[PDB]
Write a protein that binds this ligand. Structure first.
Ligand SMILES: NC(=O)c1ccc[n+]([C@@H]2O[C@H](COP(=O)([O-])OP(=O)(O)OC[C@H]3O[C@@H](n4cnc5c(N)ncnc54)[C@H](O)[C@@H]3O)[C@@H](O)[C@H]2O)c1
Ligand SMILES: NC(=O)c1ccc[n+]([C@@H]2O[C@H](COP(=O)([O-])OP(=O)(O)OC[C@H]3O[C@@H](n4cnc5c(N)ncnc54)[C@H](O)[C@@H]3O)[C@@H](O)[C@H]2O)c1
Lengths: 374, 374
């Protein structure tokens, strides 16, 4: 038994930007009141974890990154009521405290307890559960899933089906739910509509799944890597375009293709210029454009407000608009009943020890999701 | 008798930017097929008319401006079926052709036959019905209401109640409908919400009327001219703030006052900086901001897309989102049935000959709407 004791285990520590992860021993403290210690089973490699390495997404270093994962509860702190030792669980990078104005709002999901807007890299109490080489190490979004064991606040974990396959449902912790919800919840795509999806990685493929589920007649995938097109078509794209093949800006191309602009567009990359292009390719009077990609830290975009004055709607969202703790168990149940597929997103499987190879695969263009197993 | 003949009458011509209007004789051609010639009875002075004078809003010069008006049909061209000589009518600066993809959409109103996006200053057939001192003169938004007589395309006129008071219902042609619709149709303000309204002229006052009719609990008016506050409170504002009274940026003040951000905000001025402030002051996870003011020609705003990623919605609209020809007669009928008031908007009534005095009243801060009577 390890309950009440420090655990020594392996983790992937990031000591410096623009360097490989270091796989080495860390010390993981036992959970305090209203905290949960989790044995990790599987974790996905998402572009947002890479953004921590590149300095795109700023959070304090040194850090244990990872936010898309699933595992098994090892122990619970005083007062925990919503999970027990042995339960299967998904960590929630967006918490659901249930008590703030956002949690109480029908449409709100970006709980005020989040660590994303002004990242601190701690537990809710302002302290760390991790030591490495005798030094404190920061958490990431209250999750820190690149470790054999992590500690999370109770508002940042959801219990899931005991029969769930953790090497697949790890993707419900971020990329699948984000893209799917961006289409069906945030945009509210309509039957018979025309959609344009910018970026065909794991998150953009999940947006396509949601647009198909909503009954779109046309789903136009957009990527500068034409090797992404075959899988985009398998999951529902009706056509794909590469901006580098055209002499005109792709907003003009897409306006022509859609006979005056698309109904719904999605930016699923993280670039200023494609956020403005995606806006402008939606129909000027009634179009909707959703920003999903994470922008470069502290950088502003330039746009003409006449794009909005004619009637366009521009919005963004975290985690597909889903209230996290309510939604994750229901999404897992839907997956168990075959309402959506996760296999199309999983291109590579590696042991956790080969994390750096998994990041190489993402950076080269060759992977969608690599799943790491502990 | 004038039917079929050229009419010589008085108009206010703008020969070049940054000059007073010239009140002098013009010649008005008879209506061609599918056109309507109107005897003007009353026209309002809107800030958009002033933006033509200042070069804020680019349209071809020389021009007959004016777009917020009411009059009586003098004659009709071949093929007109929707109005007849003697009818009371309002000019529609946004047409409703009924045949384009925007008119057929349930939520679109910015008809593709409009002359706002790329102004040419003519009738639909690409020609002008006006001459002055032997020179052709441009039309403005297919209306040109600063003239004793104008000619409009059939898609740019609506028939209204024969008993309506034209000196009041002229405001349904632009400023009332726009502000009121921006609240009740575009934002869809909810019962119990907190709203912030930037700019307390005729259009912003009409936004306040709409927020109050929608049941908002709190309506915060924002203006640098404190003389605007008393009337804003009479029509529904619960509090007013002047940015110049505060050491901190007003987005921070309004976030504090609303215990974390407002539900709905409206930019009703036309400035890049207040568009970004208005978006920022709405709650980051579920807030909605609507741009109503007309921006400076060709200028781009700068903003951080993280304002949208957290969950805000940003939109704009023309004419309050109302389909123009369907809506204008219904709004007149609703005024006749006492469903809303127009008198709070009207501070001055002058003969048409005093047009320049009316614009100097607007520019000095001393008026809301001046109504000019022919
Ligand atoms: N809003 C949220 O809650 C949330 C959650 C998930 C991920 N993210 C963000 O979503 C984005 C996508 O994540 P992912 O894991 O799918 O990433 P990814 O890198 O696998 O996919 C991005 C795709 O964009 C393409 N691309 C790059 N530059 C392009 C350009 N100029 N034009 C067109 N295509 C271009 C790439 O070739 C790639 O296929 C990232 O920015 C990530 O940080 C946001
Ligand atoms: N979208 C549409 O269809 C539509 C229709 C109506 C008019 N317009 C636009 O709406 C806007 C308002 O028109 P109006 O006739 O009510 O104008 P107005 O000038 O009477 O009112 C604008 C108000 O803004 C205030 N103001 C100016 N600068 C400010 C600042 N920096 N901060 C705070 N307050 C400030 C003024 O003191 C004034 O009371 C104009 O830009 C006009 O062109 C748009």
């Amino acid at each position: 038994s390890t309950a009440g004791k420090v655990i020594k285990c392996k983790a992937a520590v990031l000591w410096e930007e623009k360097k490989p992860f270091s796989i080495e021993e860390v010390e993981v403290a036992p959970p305090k009141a209203h905290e949960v210690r989790i044995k990790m089973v599987a974790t996905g490699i998402c572009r947002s974890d890479d953004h921590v390495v590149s300095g795109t997404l700023v959070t304090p270093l040194p850090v244990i990154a990872g936010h898309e994962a699933a595992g098994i509860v090892e122990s619970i702190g005083e007062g925990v009521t919503t999970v027990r030792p042995g339960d299967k669980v998904i960590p929630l990078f967006t918490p659901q405290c249930g008590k703030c104005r956002v949690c109480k709002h029908p449409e709100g999901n970006f709980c005020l307890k989040n660590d994303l807007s002004m990242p601190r890299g701690t537990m809710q109490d302002g302290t760390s559960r991790f030591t490495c080489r005798g030094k404190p190490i920061h958490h990431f979004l209250g999750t820190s899933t690149f470790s054999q064991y992590t500690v999370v606040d109770e508002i940042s974990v959801a219990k899931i089906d005991a029969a769930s396959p953790l090497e697949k449902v790890c993707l419900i912790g971020c990329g699948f739910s984000t893209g799917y919800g961006s289409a069906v919840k945030v945009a509210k795509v309509t039957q018979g509509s025309t959609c344009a999806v910018f970026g065909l990685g794991g998150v953009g493929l999940s947006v396509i799944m949601g647009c198909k589920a909503a009954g779109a007649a046309r789903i136009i995938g957009v990527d500068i890597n034409k090797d992404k097109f075959a899988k985009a078509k398998e999951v529902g794209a009706t056509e794909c375009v590469n901006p580098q093949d055209y002499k005109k800006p792709i907003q003009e191309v897409l306006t022509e293709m859609s006979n005056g602009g698309v109904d719904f567009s999605f930016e699923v990359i993280g670039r200023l210029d494609t956020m403005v292009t995606a806006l402008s390719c939606c129909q000027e009077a009634y179009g909707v454009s959703v920003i999903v990609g994470v922008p470069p830290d502290s950088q502003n975009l330039s746009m003409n407000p006449m794009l909005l004055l004619s009637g366009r709607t521009w919005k963004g969202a975290i985690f597909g608009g889903f209230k996290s703790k309510d939604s994750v168990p229901k999404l897992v149940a839907d997956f168990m009943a075959k309402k959506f597929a996760l296999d199309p997103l999983i291109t590579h499987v590696l042991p956790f020890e080969k994390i750096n190879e998994g990041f190489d695969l993402l950076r080269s263009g060759e992977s969608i999701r690599t799943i790491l197993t502990f």
